[PDB]
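Summary: Need help interpreting a holo structure output

Steps to reproduce:
1. Submit the protein chain below together with the SMILES for G5Y.
2. Request a joint structure prediction with the ligand placed.
3. Inspect the structure token block that comes back.

Expected: a single structure record containing both the chain and the bound molecule.
Actual: see attached output.

Input attached:
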Amino acid sequence: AMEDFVRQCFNPMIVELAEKAMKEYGEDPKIETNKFAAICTHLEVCFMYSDFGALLKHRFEIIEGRDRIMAWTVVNSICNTTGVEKPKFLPDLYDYKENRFIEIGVTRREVHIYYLEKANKIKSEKTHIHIFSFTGEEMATKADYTLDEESRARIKTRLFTIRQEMASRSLWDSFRQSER
Ligand SMILES: O=C(O)c1occc(=O)c1O
Ligand SMILES: [Mn+2]
Ligand SMILES: [Mn+2]
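--- attached output ---
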């Protein structure tokens, strides 16, 4: 299915993680296959982002992909010893150079469309939003893209490749029309 492609095209850590997320909350990766793909994809971006970051070793902190006990434990740890307000939801990363949380968005829609939807869901938070499409289009609050272009090129390419792999297997049209 989709399932095969997912298994073929994402490192096991990411698959295992995706599956547990879905199975925990009663969702079947054999059935909600497009969703399975989307979780993997988002998680991989979240990791790739935090990889890219010789003086500030470990620029980013990863909150996505952890369980919620660890997640809030991390969030709370950061809040106590910096001052930064507590977010209502668990966001994806924390940034130590710019001292702000990041919410990572990946969308098969338009970027400004998805951007708005997320900014509406987290109106009360000073959280940086960065949105990636599968078209090499991004959008970031106050157009502060946080990463150097090299790092952003890498991400855009991974996404475009995922799209073209799916398209290659006649999986893209299903996937595209299945967001939200
Ligand atoms: O953390 C989440 O639950 C989450 O859900 C949907 C889209 C995201 O980007 C995200 O971080
Ligand atoms: Mn998240
Ligand atoms: Mn996210």
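--- end attachment ---

Reviewer comment: The pocket of manganese (II) ion (ligand 2) is lined by residues 64, 92 (CB under 6 Å). The beta strands are 60-62, 93-95, 100-107, 128-133, 138-140.
Status: needs-info
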